[PDB]
Structure 1
Amino acid sequence: DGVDIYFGMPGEISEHEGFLRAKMDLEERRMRQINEVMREWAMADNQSKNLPKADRQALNEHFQSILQTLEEQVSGERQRLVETHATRVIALINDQRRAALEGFLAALQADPPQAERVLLALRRYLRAEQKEQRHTLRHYQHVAAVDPEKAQQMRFQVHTHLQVIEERVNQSLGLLDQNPHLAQELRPQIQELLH
């Protein structure tokens, strides 16, 4: 088992689908547990119809307490899951951007710089940055859609992060200025891209 944990999720399974799978398994698990408590609570009422008022209330508090704890388990478990997933998504985005950056840079530094390759590379880099930008916007748009008091406190951070991304992109494009002859032939190509 500790061995299964070491191996973890197969490489063929992305973080997104692994996350959903895990979330789904937990949903079904907890649903079964809850159904059990609710069924037990029902049976208890039935065999309690003939008892002292006090003992009835006691039965109620018993099941309501079992549910309180279960609700707290479900809430804590979900938070852990969302936590791990968010931290991994951010890491993958930075990793993909960094790898795209190196690719672009390698194409620009190839003895006879090849146009089509440098173009596909810069394209990949730009998409990597765009992914981070979309993620920033979407997460903010999402927090606004389900938690307004929290969205308000994100404004400035989002404002700042989006500018960071845009400056990074400009600085990266500057890597081209290093090869005027190259920057020339591609001037039109990249010009279309910017859009």
Structure 2
Amino acid sequence: DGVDIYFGMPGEISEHEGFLRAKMDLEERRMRQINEVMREWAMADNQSKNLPKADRQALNEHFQSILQTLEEQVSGERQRLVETHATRVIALINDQRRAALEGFLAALQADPPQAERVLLALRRYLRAEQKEQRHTLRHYQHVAAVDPEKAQQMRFQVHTHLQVIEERVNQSLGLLDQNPHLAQELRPQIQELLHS
């Protein structure tokens, strides 16, 4: 048990599919649990017809109470599943940006800087930043789609976050300006990258 948890999911399974599969497993599990309670409650109603009012009310309370507990478990469970997935999603996006940055840095500090290697490492970096931009836009778009009130609250935060991403791209590109010749050479192509 604790050992299976340690090994976690096999690398063959992506975070996304592993998340969906876990999500589906819980959906099916909760559906079963709910149906069992609903049936018990149905059987109880059939039997209870000829019992005192105070007893029928107590019986109703008993099942309503079991469902409420079940509702809270389904909700708490979904929330944990959601936070775990969102945490892993952002973590990987940060890791990819950082790894791409180290690569861009390496290509710029090569004994004799190769325009090709530098251009490719920069492309990778700029694509990592783009992914975070899209992640940021998509999250906000999502909240506005299902919860307008919360969307208005994060508005300024999104605007700022997007500027933070843009300044990083400018700061990272400034690393290329420390080499006028190289910069002038790749300018037209980089412009194409930043434009797309």
TM range (shorter): over 0.9
Deviations 1:84-111 (A, max 9, x none): 1111111111111000111111111222
Deviations 1:108-144 (A, max 9, x none): 1222222222111111101100111111111111011
Name 1:51's counterpart in structure 2: 51
Deviations 1:38-88 (A, max 9, x none): 011111111122222222222111111000000000111111111111111
User: What TM-score comes out, normalization by structure 2 length?
Assistant: 0.96
Provide the rounded CA distance (Å) in 2 between the counterparts of 1:93 and 1:191: 24
Deviations 1:140-190 (A, max 9, x none): 110111111111110111111100000000000011111111112212111
SS in 2 for 1:154: helix
Name 1:120's counterpart in structure 2: 120
Name 2:176's counterpart in structure 1: 176
> Which moved further from structure 2: 74-83 or 28-37?
74-83
SS in 2 for 1:47: helix
Provide the rounded CA distance (Å) in 1 between the counterparts of 2:130 and 2:83: 23
Provide the rounded CA distance (Å) in 1 between the counterparts of 2:58 and 2:191: 74
User: What TM-score comes out, normalization by structure 1 length?
Assistant: 0.96
Name 2:135's counterpart in structure 1: 135
Provide the rounded CA distance (Å) in 1 between the counterparts of 2:187 and 2:158: 31
Provide the rounded CA distance (Å) in 2 between the counterparts of 1:121 and 1:183: 14
Q: How many residues align structurally?
A: 195
> Which moved further from structure 2: 109-118 or 75-84?
109-118
Give percent identity, aligned residues only: 100
Provide the rounded CA distance (Å) in 2 between the counterparts of 1:51 and 1:136: 59
For structure 1, the 5+ residue unaligned runs are none
For structure 2, the 5+ residue unaligned runs are none
CA RMSD of superposed structures (Å)? 1.1
Name 2:32's counterpart in structure 1: 32
